[PDB]
């Protein structure tokens, strides 16, 4: 059970590290969809509180 | 059981959706002096931008005096500090 | 590009540096000022506000001029780790000072790192025979444990440690890390001679030990730090290369004394006896790192100095709770010429338990202590009335205790130039039997002197025959 | 005014604001305070002669009066500011008195604070809710070089689980 | 540039001046090129030493009676760190 738990935890940690690296690389590849979504989110939030 | 890593990624997907204070004046020896935090309670918990938590103990006129729950290498002058809105508390049962 | 500050203030070991714009060096980071010499190192202690930091120098501040350019190195103090540092003599700033070129390691590590977590803890109760009667018998040391020698000036913490290095370190196989904090450079120069001769250090060969030295001539920043350098090195050998590390610190007191030396200039209100208000947690950060973990064993002996011979001074008081076996040197006992000048009644260990040493060694111990404690209780009546006023049972205990007492003394090979008699190493099974026999009065008929400064029970019968001629 | 501004060191500029707020005398005080700092910092002359703990009471007053008669905007209530700091030994911190005067005009006739990146617009309309919404949309599209807050929050949540 | 010659208070001071002296210390003003632990001479030839250097003033320890110093006095550098004849 200790070996099965250690393997599952190692696999989850390795997968999380690979996902983190992919997310960081995508943001550095000038994302046009990220820039347009950041301006629209700010306007919607300020109109719901006023 | 059947890809246990996929269940943790789907539950921690949408969380950050409603998160839009004082600045640090000086920091040393577990203490941070902080300009601002105007609505803060005596003995209230504060998160520093860096992650480390702290407690407000000296609400003086110009500034607030905070003891840290962590190390301080991670806190720098000017770094933004944040109100929790809670007094230190524990799980029970 | 480079981040440069300006020297705004110098007070003793403290330097204040102003940085032009926004990005202030983190707390604990190294700074560098270029000297005509080589360079001066600095450690960012605190942010004073208004783009000024206050640092502690790792060296003398003579000649510093207000306005001076100060280079930020963007990381804690670094030290060469791993097998490359074995048989090299090192700095507080992790540099070669053995006149023998660059320590060409692969990695440089910060000296500052968080202590091993609670989940990462790892305990066990294995005896580590030392060949020292008082210890072996009364307060057994533990393999991978934390040992500490307490004593005031000139009782013999240094010579005692050299006896431990003598026995354990030879037949140990694995790696050692010796750290000279605030001691004599003579002693450090002697220890470098001593190793090249036993072959622990082989300049042309391989080597089992490493040397790090922030000695008593150093400024308080140097000495407030040099032990963290030692530690980082050991921590590598423990966690990365999964090794049994023997880690001798001498003297760990000199780290907390340095902490106070700078503390007022750091602007702090002092605390009891004029110590830095942080004395406990600054020790907890350092002590909690010297440890066995689930990744590697560390046995460590530390030399503890005791200011003014006061055990309740807040430096040693706070230490104790960090050790696994504590063995104290009494000045009085040394003035009796008893060496090692241990306190048979103040020394402790977690390992003196029947579950570990076994009912007999357990009981030979207790009964020895009762005997000694009784002698102690009577010290007053004997001081005024003398022996003749004691009863019969009392009278015996004293003659016996005075024998047990002298028998606890042992010639040390390293201390030979002080006894004259070539040193002895008794074994654990040897010691227990020996004492048990005396406690069964099987030797009562032997002059007290025979028990003084000899090995095991065989040596007593020898010397007594020698003198009875 | 409700601005606080400390209570011992910050009260130097607040003390004279009370007398300068009569008969429309706040406008001329802004341009006169800037001439005192500029002719002492980037002049190397009267700085080293006044920052020392020598001179006298009469000598400090005569130096201030002679400079003020040939400089721009110093004939109203400006002469009285320098006299108070000469006798009480406070000429060394002349940058603090001039800085705390400007903050009064910008708080009761404008906005302050910040938002993200550089500075915000600092409008002088009325309420802060109707000002910030109409200025955020116009400053996000025009400029905004973007040289991260959302990325840092997401990474921390995944390492704690 | 017009306020330089209009003052007339001897704007040519290169040395430092005693701000206050007492209890074996003297807080000198200026001495900007001074270095820590460097020696200093006072108007009456009494040698001091530069202890701490702050923004604004230099703490100087007197190698002598305080009487031999006065607030206001001119103080000269030696360029020497505290030193002795040898050989
Ligand atoms: N086991 C011993 N046998 C014989 N002499 C000893 C022993 N231990 C200490 N001494 C004597 O006591 C002196 C001081 O011993 P030392 O090992 O320098 O103690 P220390 O307590 O580490 N002194 P210090 O490091 O200056 O605070 C030596 O010169 C020895 O003569």
Descriptive overview:
The structure is cut from a larger assembly and holds one copy of chain A (50 residues), two copies of chain B, one copy of chain C (469 residues) and one copy of chain D (161 residues). Helices cover 86% and strands 0% of the residues of chain A. Chain B is mainly β. Chain B has one domain: Elongation Factor Tu (Ef-tu), domain 3. Helices cover 8% and strands 41% of the residues of chain B. Chain D is mostly helical and 161 residues long. In chain D, 55% of the residues lie in helices and 0% in strands. In chain D, helix 1 crosses helix 6, helix 2 runs antiparallel to helix 6 and helix 4 packs antiparallel against helix 5. The interface between D and E is medium-sized, with 19 and 19 residues. Phosphoaminophosphonic acid-adenylate ester binds next to helix 2 and helix 13 of chain C. It is classed as membrane protein. Keywords: Complex, Proton transporter, membrane protein.
Quick summary of this structure?
The structure is cut from a larger assembly and holds one copy of chain A (about 50 residues), two copies of chain B, one copy of chain C (about 475 residues) and one copy of chain D (about 160 residues). Chain B has one helix spanning about 5-10, and strands at about 20-30, 30-35, 45-50, 55-60, 65-70, 80-85. By secondary structure, chain B is mainly beta.
Can you give keywords for this protein?
part of a larger assembly; 5 chains; A: 50 residues; mainly alpha; 2 helices; 0% strand; B: Elongation Factor Tu (Ef-tu), domain 3; 6 strands; 41% strand; transit peptide (chain D); ATPase_OSCP/d_CS (chain D); ATP synthesis (chain D)
User: What is the radius of gyration of chain A?
Assistant: 19 Å
| Principal-axes shape call of chain A | elongated
User: If you compute it from the alpha carbons, what radius of gyration of chain C comes out, rounded to the nearest whole angstrom?
Assistant: 25 Å
Distance between the termini of chain A: 56 Å
By CATH's scheme, which homologous superfamily of the largest domain in chain C applies? P-loop containing nucleotide triphosphate hydrolases
Approximate strand percentage of chain A: under 5%
Q: Give the cofactors and ligands.
A: phosphoaminophosphonic acid-adenylate ester
Q: What structural class is derived from the secondary structure elements of chain C?
A: alpha/beta
Describe the strand arrangement of the main beta sheet of chain C, using strand numbers: 8-12-11-13-14-10-15-16
Biggest sheet statistics of chain C: 8 strands, mixed
Task: Kindly state the percentage of residues in helix of chain A.
Answer: over 70%
The structural domain count of chain C equals: 3
Helical run tally of chain A? 2
CATH fold name of the largest domain in chain C: Rossmann fold
Assembly annotation: part of a larger assembly
**Approximate helicity band of chain C:** 25-40%
Distance between the termini of chain C: 84 Å
What fraction strand of chain C? Answer: 15-25%
Total number of beta strands of chain C: 16
Question: Which structural class fits the helix and strand makeup of chain A?
Answer: mainly alpha
Please work out how many helical segments of chain C DSSP would assign.
15
């Amino acid at each position: 059970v200790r070996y099965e738990a250690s393997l599952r935890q190692l696999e989850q940690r390795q997968l999380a590290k690979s996902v983190i690296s992919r997310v960081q690389s995508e943001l550095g590849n000038p994302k046009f969809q990220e820039k347009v979504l950041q301006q629209s989110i700010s306007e919607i939030e300020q109109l719901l509180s006023k | 059981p059947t890809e246990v890593s996929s269940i943790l990624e789907e539950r921690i997907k949408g969380v950050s959706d409603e998160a839009n204070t004082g600045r640090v004046l000086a920091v040393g020896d577990g203490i941070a002096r902080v300009f601002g935090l105007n609505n803060i309670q005596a003995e209230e918990l504060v998160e520093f931008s860096s992650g480390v938590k702290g407690m407000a103990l000296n609400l003086e006129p110009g500034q607030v005096g905070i003891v840290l729950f962590g190390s301080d290498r991670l806190v720098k002058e000017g770094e933004l500090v944040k109100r929790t809105g809670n007094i230190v508390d524990v799980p029970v049962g | 590009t480079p981040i440069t500050g300006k020297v705004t203030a110098v007070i003793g070991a403290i330097v204040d540096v102003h940085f032009e714009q926004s990005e202030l060096p983190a707390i604990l980071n190294a700074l560098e000022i270029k000297t005509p010499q080589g360079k001066l190192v600095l450690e960012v202690a605190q942010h004073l506000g208004e783009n000024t930091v206050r640092t502690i120098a790792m060296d003398g501040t003579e000649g510093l001029v207000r306005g001076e350019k100060v280079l930020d190195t963007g990381g804690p103090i670094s030290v060469p780790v791993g097998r490359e540092t074995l048989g090299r003599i090192i700095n507080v700033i992790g540099e070669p000072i053995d006149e023998r070129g660059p320590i060409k390691s692969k990695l440089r590590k910060p000296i500052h790192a968080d202590p091993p977590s609670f989940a990462e803890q790892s305990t066990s109760a294995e005896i580590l025979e030392t060949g020292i009667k008082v210890v072996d018998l009364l307060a057994p040391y533990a393999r991978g444990g934390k040992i500490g020698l307490f004593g005031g000036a000139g009782v013999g913490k240094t010579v005692f440690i050299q006896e431990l290095i003598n026995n354990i370190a030879k037949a140990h196989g694995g790696f050692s890390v010796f750290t000279g904090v605030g001691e004599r450079t003579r002693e450090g120069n002697d220890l470098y001679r001593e190793m090249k001769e036993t072959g622990v250090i082989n300049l042309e060969g391989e080597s089992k030990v490493a040397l790090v030295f922030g000695q008593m001539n150093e400024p308080p920043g140097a000495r407030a730090r040099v032990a963290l350098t030692g530690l980082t090195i050991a921590e590598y050998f423990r966690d990365e290369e999964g090794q049994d590390v023997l880690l001798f610190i001498d003297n760990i007191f000199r780290f907390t004394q340095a902490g106070s030396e700078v503390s007022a200039l750091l602007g702090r209100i002092p605390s009891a006896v004029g110590y830095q208000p942080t004395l406990a947690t600054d020790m907890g950060l350092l002590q909690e790192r010297i440890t066995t973990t689930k990744k590697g064993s560390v046995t460590s002996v530390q030399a503890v100095y005791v200011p003014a011979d006061d055990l309740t001074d807040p430096a040693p008081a706070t230490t104790f709770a960090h050790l696994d076996a504590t063995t104290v040197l009494s000045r009085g006992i040394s003035e009796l010429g008893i060496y090692p000048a241990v306190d048979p009644l103040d020394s402790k260990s977690r390992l003196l338990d029947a579950a570990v040493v076994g009912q007999e060694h357990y009981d030979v111990a207790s009964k020895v202590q009762e005997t000694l404690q009784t002698y102690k209780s009577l010290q007053d009546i004997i001081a005024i009335l003398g022996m003749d006023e004691l009863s019969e049972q009392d009278k015996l205990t004293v003659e016996r205790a005075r024998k047990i007492q002298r028998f606890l003394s042992q010639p040390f090979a390293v201390a030979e130039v002080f006894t004259g008699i070539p040193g002895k190493l008794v074994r654990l099974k040897d010691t227990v039997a020996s004492f048990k026999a005396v406690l069964e009065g099987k030797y009562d008929n032997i002059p007290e002197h025979a028990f003084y400064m000899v090995g095991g029970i065989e040596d007593v019968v020898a010397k007594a025959e020698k003198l009875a001629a | 005014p409700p601005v606080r501004l400390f209570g011992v060191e910050g009260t130097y500029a607040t003390a004279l604001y009370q007398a300068a707020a009569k008969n429309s005398s706040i406008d001329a005080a802004f341009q006169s305070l800037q001439k005192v700092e500029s002719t002492v910092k980037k002049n190397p002359k009267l700085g080293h002669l006044l920052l020392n703990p020598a001179l006298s009471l009469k000598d400090r007053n005569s130096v201030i009066d002679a400079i003020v008669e040939t400089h721009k905007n110093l004939d109203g209530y400006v002469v009285n500011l320098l006299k108070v700091l000469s006798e009480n030994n406070r000429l060394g911190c002349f940058e603090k008195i001039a800085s705390d005067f400007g903050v009064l005009n910008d708080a009761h006739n404008g906005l302050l604070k910040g938002t993200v990146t550089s500075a915000e617009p600092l409008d002088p309309k009325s309420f802060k809710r109707i000002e910030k919404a109409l200025s955020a949309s116009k400053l996000v599209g025009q400029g905004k070089s973007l040289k991260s807050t959302k990325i840092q929050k997401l990474n921390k949540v995944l390492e704690d689980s």
